[PDB]
């Protein structure tokens, strides 16, 4: 190798001595004298002399811990949670060593060298992990690295002054490490990775502990990594059973975030919906049903509910995603041009020309571009109406460039395109806000102004499929559906697709059981 001779023996001796100390000494003066003596001895053995020697020290320690894990598993299999307790014996010892070396690195006020040491060690561990993954392949075990990472995270999130002065930077280091170990880059570690990013304490420290919400974008990045990895598997229905574990983990963390951090799921709903395939009704529903806890949703079954007279209706939701960038510059320019001047009309056929990418069934369109187009046209419409001195309604969103785009997409797109379009609209049907209201009115208008029953039945089936899911449900979705069914102006029950079919009746019964 490239290691200096005799270093392995030094590292072995030191690691074993430290394990012994760790499992012999109690908290108090004993732990401090033990760590001080051990550090002194580290200086004596000339391991802290150069950065390289430190690197090789941590690397050798990691490798030895891992090999102890493997050997322990083997010895277990040969001789019929205790083995777990051995692996974790050595691993927890080493972790304690790392945390202590980070905590007491340099001065008490000098946080720089502490964080640098933390990122150094984490990097080394990452290297060992990736190497082990590339070599062992199928025999690779996630457990030791998982243990190291989570126990180090827990140790460094202790209620101590020095540790609290560097907490956010610690969390930053761990976020970077988790991002580098993303399942698209380290597939053999995806389960442990999911366990690490969906750990309750990590989530707590990321989404609550830090002010200014600087932790929200990072965790959002982690979740987006997860969804990006899961998308092609979740999209194929034949992989439902083998993906049960990861799906249930994702469902779990989404449930956690829903019940305890709904604001976060609100602020980043668009990116998540953008990455998660449209067939995953449940997860997406968890993401869309989220609403700020300082808001009280009125009962959708309230006798004659005045939606337009709600206070939060005129307020716009916060979107922390740059959906505009998905649009090409020239297309965006032509879009703004037509929105400003309502000319020329050819721009609409050109719209279908711009949204479609392939002729292959299922992969004909650019989903992100459709979502972005819908949301952008919607927001521009809301702003336009607001600038005219009025609020969006059934008679204020009509006969304009925006609605021209909407109706044209509603007729000129094929069934697939229409589905993606209607879904792109439905993704904004959430808690009382300007987007929810505008897109509700847009959906209902598209239903009413329709010249054929195709798009009507399609809308109905979209709402239906989005409603058949465990409680809760997005407010605007249920509101839109209820308004469509109850308001005699839309004459819903006089149509043919609902008159004959007992299938859509079954769907209606399911919706009645889930939402009513």
């Amino acid at each position: 190798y490239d290691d200096p001779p005799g270093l392995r023996e030094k590292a072995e001796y030191l690691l074993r001595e430290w394990v012994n100390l760790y499992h012999s000494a109690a908290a108090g003066r004993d732990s401090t004298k033990a760590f001080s003596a051990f550090v002194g001895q580290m200086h004596q053995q000339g391991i802290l002399k150069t950065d390289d020697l430190i690197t090789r020290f941590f690397r050798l320690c990691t490798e030895m811990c891992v090999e102890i894990s493997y050997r322990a598993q083997a010895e277990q299999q040969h001789n019929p949670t205790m083995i777990r307790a051995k692996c974790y014996h050595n691993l927890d010892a080493f972790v304690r060593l790392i945390a202590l070396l980070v905590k007491h690195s340099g001065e008490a006020t000098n946080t720089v060298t502490k964080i640098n040491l933390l990122n150094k060690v984490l990097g080394i561990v990452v290297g060992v992990l990736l190497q082990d993954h590339d070599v062992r392949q199928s025999e690779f075990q996630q457990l030791p690295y998982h243990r190291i990472f989570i126990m180090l995270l827990l140790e460094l999130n202790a209620p101590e002054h020095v540790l609290e002065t560097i907490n956010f930077q610690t969390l930053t280091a761990f976020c970077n490490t988790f991002h580098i170990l993303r399942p698209t880059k380290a597939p053999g570690f995806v389960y442990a990775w999911l366990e690490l990013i969906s750990h309750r304490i990590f989530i707590a420290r990321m989404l609550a502990h830090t002010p200014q919400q600087k932790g929200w974008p990072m965790y959002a990045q982690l979740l987006i990594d997860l969804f990006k990895y899961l998308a092609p598997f979740l999209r194929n229905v034949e992989l439902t059973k083998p993906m049960q574990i990861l799906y249930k983990g994702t469902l779990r963390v989404l449930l956690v975030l829903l019940h305890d951090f709904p604001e976060f799921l609100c602020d980043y709903h668009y990116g998540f919906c953008d990455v998660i395939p449209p067939n995953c009704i449940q997860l997406r529903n968890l993401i869309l049903s989220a609403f700020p806890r300082n808001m009280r949703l009125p009962d959708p079954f309230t006798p004659n509910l005045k939606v337009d007279m709600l206070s939060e209706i005129n307020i716009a939701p916060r979107i922390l995603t740059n959906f505009t960038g998905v649009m090409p510059p020239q297309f965006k320019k032509d879009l703004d041009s037509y929105l400003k001047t309502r000319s020329p009309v050819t721009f609409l056929s050109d719209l279908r020309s711009n949204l479609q990418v392939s002729n292959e069934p299922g992969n004909r369109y650019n989903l992100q571009l459709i979502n972005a187009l819908v949301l952008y046209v919607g927001t521009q419409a809301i702003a336009h109406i607001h600038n005219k001195g009025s609020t969006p309604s059934m008679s204020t969103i009509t006969h304009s460039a925006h609605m021209d785009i909407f109706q044209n997409l509603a007729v000129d797109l094929d069934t697939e395109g229409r589905y993606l379009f209607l879904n792109a609209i439905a993704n904004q049907l959430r808690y009382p806000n300007s987007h929810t209201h505008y897109f509700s009115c847009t959906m209902l208008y598209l239903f009413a102004e329709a010249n054929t029953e195709a798009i009507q039945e399609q809308i109905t089936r979209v709402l239906l499929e989005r409603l058949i899911v465990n409680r809760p449900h997005p407010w605007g979705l249920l509101i839109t559906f209820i308004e469509l069914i109850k308001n005699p102006a839309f004459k819903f029950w006089n149509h043919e697709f609902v008159h004959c079919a007992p299938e859509i009746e079954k769907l209606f019964q399911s919706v009645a059981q889930c939402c009513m």
Partner: peptide, 14 residues
């Protein structure tokens, strides 16, 4: 179903 009230008059448990 034939209307809104007709839909609300459904008997699911039976």
């Amino acid at each position: 179903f034939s209307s809104w009230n007709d839909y609300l008059g459904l008997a699911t448990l039976i």
